[PDB]
Structure formats: C-alpha cells, structure tokens
C-alpha cells in the first residue's frame, strides 16, 4: 500500500523538518582529497573521515558567495530538506556544519559518477536503460511531492550512479516545501518548464515537465530544446514544438508529448490521476514498480569501481585552497544551518 508507506514517511519527515539536525561534525574531522564537481557557487570534494576511515562527498559553500548571489533562503532550504528526507534514490546527508567562512554538507560518496558523463560518452541510452532510470525519478518525485516538496533541478549532472547502478539524486539547492504556487526563476535552462519562464507562478508540475526533458535527453543523447544561449532556449521551450529522433518508439513519443505538454490541465503528473497516468503508461508497461523501489531489478550498467576513494568516474577539476577566516561571516544569516 503506497498510502500507508507515504503516510508514515510524512510523519518521519515532519519530525525532522520541525527540529533539524545541526552541527554534526567539523572540518578537521576530514582530510580533503580532491574536487569531484562544481556548480554555480559550490564545490564538492572527495574526503576521508579520520576516525571511521570512510570516504564522503563534502559540499562546500562560501557564505559570502551565497549571500552575494542572494541564495540564502535556497541554501537553508537545501540543508533543511536534505537532512529530513529518506528514500532509496536520494543521496544521504551524513553530516553538516559551518565555520567562520563556509557551510558544509557531507554526503555519502556516490562513486559511479554523474549520469551526465556516461550519457555524453556513450552518446545515448537504450529505451530500457533510460526507462530504468526514469522509473527511479518517477518514484522519487512521488515521494518528494507527497511531502509538499518541489525539486526543481532535475538534470543528468545532478544524478549520480551508485555501485549497484541505481540513481542517487543530489543537489537540493532549489528544493522547496511549498503548498501551491511559487515564482522563483531557478533551475537549469534546458530543463525549465514554460510556466517558469513566463513568470506565471507554477507548482510541482514543473518537475514532471523536467522528467520529460530528462527522458528525452537520456533517449536522444541531446535535449529537446537546445541552443547556444539560454534566451534562445527559452524561445524554443515556449513554442513547445518538439521533434523526436527517428529511433524513438511510438510509446516513448506518446509519453513525452504528455510530459512536455505546455498545457497544465493536460500535463501528465498534473491530472486527476496524478503519477498513475505516468506509471500506467504503455512505455512503462514492463516496469515492476515495486521491484524498482526495492532495488531488485538488474541494472543495465554498473560503473567500474576500483577501491574506496577512486574517482575515475569523475572529471578532474582545478583545486583551490579552502580558506577559513578568523572572523565569523554572516553569522546571523545562517543561524539555523
């Protein structure tokens, strides 16, 4: 029974939402090894936890950069939510803390790398491969949405492949607990729903739009709407005209027309039957939703793993000193972190 599972899941989440974890480690408990990845204003490092010997991924945020980009509320959101959630395809936050200069979120290290790099290297995924991933996102969104959470940053760069070949969603930077509508222009351009772009107000159905983009991109090897500049991308999205590769199944194309639907009254995920319109679509007919939840399905691809702190599934990045001022910065701003 999904109903009962989700009901208890909400109880668990709310407890943590109401009284969040805080200050569960400190910087000198870790040796910093190397950068795994970056975003517009964050850096993630592979690190080794001294007393356990375990490896982790440490997301480092410079408080002054957070502020300068007006991302305070988003960042508080990110940590508040991440610390509260619990789902098989969501990355685990293991520790969090702050110091004079930075905020830290220490996650489980997902050593298989970004879906992005595999996708680009391989070129595209078969429909069964794409479907395997897609199913995970469907369930994750079912989970998140049920808690009044909107994710808002679905993309291959934010999806990690684990040692079993299953997905782990990372980057809750734009996650928000909202009942009804919100207005922030945030996300990644190729993935933005038309209603985000048009400053209309929008709800959780943007996540379902993004799922469409994701499936297309996984299946095609390129996104449904691309161009050299974000503004050209926005024009295309807003037109909503979509073309599909020759090799796309009929089933696939039908699903995507219903996900990349510019009309909210028509978009799958946002109808009377909700996620069930997606789950019961012919394209997912072969999907055993429970088996997926339980991680019992055989993964199409399992990343090569060589030891505990192997990073060979990740690109190399330019390193920089992790500076900590002797003066506390933005103390008030980040009190609850």
């Amino acid at each position: 029974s999904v109903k009962e599972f989700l009901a208890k899941a909400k109880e668990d989440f709310l407890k943590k939402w109401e009284t969040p974890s805080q200050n569960t480690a400190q910087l000198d408990q870790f040796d910093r090894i190397k950068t795994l990845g970056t975003g517009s204003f964050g850096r993630v490092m592979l690190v080794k936890h001294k007393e356990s010997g375990n490896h982790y991924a440490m997301k480092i945020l410079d408080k002054q950069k957070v502020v300068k980009l007006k991302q305070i509320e988003h960042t508080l959101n990110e940590k508040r939510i991440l610390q509260a959630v619990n789902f098989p395809f969501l990355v685990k936050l293991e520790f969090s803390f702050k110091d004079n200069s930075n905020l830290y979120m220490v996650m489980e290290y997902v050593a298989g790398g970004e879906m992005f790099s595999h996708l680009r290297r391989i070129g595209r995924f078969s429909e069964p491969h794409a479907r395997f991933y897609a199913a995970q996102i469907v369930l994750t969104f079912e989970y998140l949405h049920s808690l009044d959470l909107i994710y808002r940053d679905l993309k291959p760069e934010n999806l990690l492949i684990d040692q079993q070949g299953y997905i782990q969603v990372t980057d809750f930077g734009f996650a928000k607990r909202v009942k009804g509508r919100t207005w922030t222009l945030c996300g990644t351009p190729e993935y933005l729903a038309p209603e985000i772009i048009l400053s209309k107000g929008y709800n959780k159905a943007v996540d379902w739009w993004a799922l469409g983009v994701l499936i297309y991109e996984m299946a095609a090897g390129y996104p449904p709407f691309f161009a050299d500049q974000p503004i050209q991308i926005y024009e295309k999205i807003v037109s909503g005209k979509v073309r599909f590769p020759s090799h796309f199944s009929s089933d696939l194309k039908d699903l995507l027309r219903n996900l990349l639907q510019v009309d909210l009254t028509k978009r799958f995920g946002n109808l009377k039957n909700g996620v069930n319109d997606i789950k019961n679509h012919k394209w997912f007919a072969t999907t055993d939703w429970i088996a997926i939840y339980q991680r019992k399905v055989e993964a199409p691809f399992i990343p090569k793993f060589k030891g505990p702190g192997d990073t060979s599934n990740f690109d190399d990045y330019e390193e920089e000193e992790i500076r900590v001022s002797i003066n506390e910065k933005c103390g008030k701003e980040f009190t609850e972190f």
Binding site: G221, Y222, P230
Partner: peptide
C-alpha cells in the same frame, strides 16, 4: 543532423544552474 548540430553547440558540457 540534430546530433551534429548539438555537438557543435556551446552547451554540450556540464550545465550550471540559474537563479534569478
């Protein structure tokens, strides 16, 4: 081809978030 046009475009690497 669309593939070729994508590959030749400026947005084939990792994409950063936007937040206005």
């Amino acid at each position: 081809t669309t593939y070729a046009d994508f590959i030749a475009s400026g947005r084939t690497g990792r994409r950063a978030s936007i937040h206005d």
